[PDB]
Each structure stands twice: as structure tokens, then as C-alpha cells.
Amino acid sequence: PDLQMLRTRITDTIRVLEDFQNLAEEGRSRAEYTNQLLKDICAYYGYNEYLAEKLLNLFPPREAFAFFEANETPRPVVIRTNTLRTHRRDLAQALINRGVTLEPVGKWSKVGLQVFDSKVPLGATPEYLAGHYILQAASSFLPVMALCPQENERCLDMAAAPGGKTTHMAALMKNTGVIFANDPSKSRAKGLIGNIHRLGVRNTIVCNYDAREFPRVIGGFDRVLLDAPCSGTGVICKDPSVKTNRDAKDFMQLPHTQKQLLLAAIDSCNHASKTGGYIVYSTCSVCVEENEEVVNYALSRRPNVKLVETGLPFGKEGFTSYMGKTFHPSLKLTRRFYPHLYNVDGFFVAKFKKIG
Amino acid sequence: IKNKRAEKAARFSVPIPKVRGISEEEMFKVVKTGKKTHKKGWKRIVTKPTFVGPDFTRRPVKYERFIRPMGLRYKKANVTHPTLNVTVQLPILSVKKNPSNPLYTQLGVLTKGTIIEVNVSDLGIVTASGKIAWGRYAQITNNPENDGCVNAVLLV
């Protein structure tokens, strides 16, 4: 039908839901109004009923509208400067002299810059070719800041296929220590090794493993990062398949794998660590079935681990309760990011300390 | 399909750093300025239409001297769905098999009867599991070297 008419119906329905008690109909109910909104938004934004209903259930009407706008809108171009090669000011000065529009992403990061437009390809700059910066997203900035690594540590990245998080870790460990970068994909492991060598990381071990096998393989890591595979509900702009290709069986399969991966990470980290016993669970999904369900599972089936403060600038507290499921009260510490609040992909981070 | 495209491109379009790399002709001219002695016939131009994908890519030394011009590159094809009888313009995702030459299918040469990967998202084809297809096989069934357009029939 007419997409302008569909949007007009969406706006009218949001207003009706805002002022249902005052502005209503003769006998039509709030359930009917929400059904009209759901059908309209599925027909306009090209979502399926299942995922659209989860997103509408998670957000209030107006905030849901903003969330869907943000999902339809491409996120900004951000570059992480390599501390192992240069620093932000010199890199920005060189890129500005080369003809690109650069400025710091904010006060939360000291090692990142935003590009407003360019005159030359940013992947073709001599600085990039020498490994002075990497094209990366703020959502991937956050997990390393949560798992700030120290020098001379042994760390395990359980899904490091792109390589940005691994290179961030090695920059903060100042090319000291050992990093175990794992990928289940060899074709993407090619690009991972390429980024590692371009950015100049000498403390890495690239392995092709299912991440559930690490307590068997080596285990005992000082710090563990788990960017779990997920639905991709926070990266809808980059992968528009999520809108119509995520249903009940998928949302049952993925969380089970996430549970097993988090349990493997917990078992692979060690308790008696002289410098850190931290596991960071991370994902780019906003769905509850993929968020804080895994954390409640972890806290309920290994009591030898506890949630700690993320030490992280921004975000909202996680959901202590939801549609019937009551969670462990500590999940308010886990923090959550949305594209419309913060112009960063929908993201979720959680920090664990082992105690036994 | 066109109305959906117009809505998206008219009211979900936002400023984004949008640039492209230089062409293989520019790269070849630069490396030739760098290399004086020109071996005779060191440049063979691919004179057939091609699909590439990215813009500023560095090719392996195996293929580094194959030059595919901008005037011959193609990005979209007129793809016909037979059962849902309709032809639409769709982007080309990859080149899967040129039945004339493995070198052609490596280079992305588009000839008659050539299997390519096409984005079929706009069609809204529902799969058996209930999902929307994001890529299908389509056979180029015209002579793109003689016709300034690429015509494909979708194998569904």
C-alpha cells in the first residue's frame, strides 16, 4: 500500500498509545491498537512479525520508532589509531593534511577518531598501509575497554575473525604477553592474520578452533573475551537479512550456543590470577533471548563467578526483570547500547570475575 | 519494488563518507612511469564486459596485468523471474562460472550462458523455511559484448 499512508498510521497509532486513556475509540482496545501498529510497521519497514514483535515489546512506542529509524540509518565511519605505531593527534594531523575530515569520537575514547568525509580512499592511505589506523566500529571499541588487558598477560579472544578487538588488546598490552586469537573460519582467518601483520602485532597465536574446545586445548588464560555469534539485531543496517530471516528456531539455536560459549570461557579463565580473572561477554544483539539470559545461566550454573562493574563510560543498566522471567539482581551492572540513544550499533557487554 | 526503492533512497539516505579508489588503468600508468623498459605486449586488455565488485583492490601477481576497463564493467543486470513472470534490475553479487574459460570466471567476464550470483531481496521470494532469499543463481542469456546490457534468467 501507500508507504506515506503507512507511516501516517504509525504516527497516529503511536500518539493513540501515548494518550490511550484520553484519546481513544468507542470499543477498540489497546491490544487492537498495538496489533495495527505491528502490522503497519512490518509492512513499512520490511520486518517479519516475530522480530518486529520482539523489538516492539522491548521498546516503548516512540522509542521503538526511533530504534527502527536508526536501524534503517547507516552508522558513522570510525577509525581506531594504533598505539603501537602512532597517536591520535599525529594521525589526525597527517590525515587532515592528506584531505580527510577527522575529529575525536568524544571524551570516552583516547584511541579513536570519526570521519565526516574524505577525498582519498581511507583504506589506501600510506598511514593505513603502514598500520597507523584500522577501520572499526565503536561497538567493537567497547569490549576491549571492558576487558582492559595489562602487560605480560595471557588472553583468549574466542571469536577474532575481523581482528580489530585483538589488535586493540595487543596495543593495550604494549606487544607483551600472549594472545590466543581463535576463529572457526579459515577464509576470515586470512583477513585476521592480514590485519595483525599490518598493524604490527607480535604476541598473537592465530588458531582455527571451535571456541568450546579451549579448556581442553590450553585453558588457564588470564583474561578472556567472548564476542559471541548472535542474531545481529544491532547490526541490521550492515546486514539487512536480519529483518526477515530470524524466527523462533533461530532464536532457540543461537542462545544455546551462546550459553555453551560463555561456560567454556568461564572454565578457560583461571581464578588464582595475580593480575586479572576477567571474562567479558559481548554481543551485537539487543534481543533478551540473546542478552542477560546467557548471563543469568552463567551465574546460576557456576556460582564461582560474579558480575563486576564494567568500568565503562556510557550505556544503560540491563533489565533485572522481563516478561515473566525474573533475573539475578546483579544484572543491572551489565550495560546496553542502542543506535538511537547512542550512534553505536546495538550492543551488550558484561564483565565477570572468577573467584574459584 | 520501485516504490520501495524510492522510499528507502529518498527518506533513509544520510550523509556518509562516499569515495572510490583509482582504476587499474591509472595504476598501470603509474607503475609504467615507475618501470621504464616496456616489454612488448606486457599489457593485454580484457575486451569483454566484466564484473568486479570492490573498487581499490590489489590483485595477485598472477592476474596483476589483466586490465578491466570502467567502460566495460557492469554492476546490475536485467534478471527475469519465470514463474513470477517479471523482469527487474538487480545488482550482481558474484561470478560463479563462465562455461568458456576458468580464467574468464576468475576475471568476472560476462558472456552468454554465464552463471552469476544475483541479489533477489527486492523480489520477496519466500523460501521453504519461511525466509526471504538474498541471493540466487541467474544465467546470462544474451551477448553483453554486442548488447550494452546484461540479461539474465533466474534459476528457481
Binding site: 522509542e63 571524551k107 553505536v344 | -
Partner: peptide, 14 residues
């Protein structure tokens, strides 16, 4: 309006 005024990444300079 759902935009943290301190650290929301803008699309345009400054």
C-alpha cells in the same frame, strides 16, 4: 529526542 546530549555521535561536523 532519544539522544544523549553528551556523547551521541553526530553525522555532521561538530
Amino acid at each position: 529526542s532519544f539522544a544523549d546530549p553528551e556523547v551521541y555521535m553526530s553525522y555532521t561536523p561538530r
